[PDB]
Amino acid sequence: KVFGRCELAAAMKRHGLDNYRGYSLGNWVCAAKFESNFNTQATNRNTDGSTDYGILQINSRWWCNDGRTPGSRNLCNIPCSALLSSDITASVNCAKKIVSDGNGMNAWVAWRNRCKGTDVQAWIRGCRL
Ligand SMILES: [Cl-]
Ligand code: NA
């Protein structure tokens, strides 16, 4: 599923991400834009043999089991394919763990490089939330 900006903003808010660990909703929307272009089906292989899955590109090195990432962890206790559903529940629940790992949203290098320090309000402008 390719979400619209406001559709994703609404879903993320419903699932408790607005101000989660102090990160406003626009941060999460911005992160999803640059991680996946709002596409739940997005997958991308990392140089180390892990893969990133879903709207927030969650990495199999640490967070989910994809059956092909040796010597990795599954801290969200899920198959990575669950992170590709039209329904973002699994991605959101796992993201809540990630953002608590010590680095906050810096865990998403695309957030740090493209969203951090921006007028993130722009991402939810116009949306009826
Ligand atoms: Cl933080
Ligand atoms: Na894993």
Curated annotation (Swiss-Prot):
Location(s), subcellular: Secreted
Annotated PROSITE patterns: GLYCOSYL_HYDROL_F22_1, GLYCOSYL_HYDROL_F22_2
Disulphide linkage map: C6-C127, C30-C115, C64-C80, C76-C94
GO MF, one annotated term: lysozyme activity
Summary of the tissues where the protein is detected: In the egg white and polymorphonuclear leukocytes.
Domain C-type lysozyme: 1-129
Reactions that this protein is recorded to catalyse: Hydrolysis of (1->4)-beta-linkages between N-acetylmuramic acid and N-acetyl-D-glucosamine residues in a peptidoglycan and between N-acetyl-D-glucosamine residues in chitodextrins
Coiled-coil residue spans: none
Enzyme Commission number(s): 3.2.1.17
PANTHER family, per database record: LYSOZYME C
Protein's UniProt name: Lysozyme C
Species assigned in the record: Gallus gallus
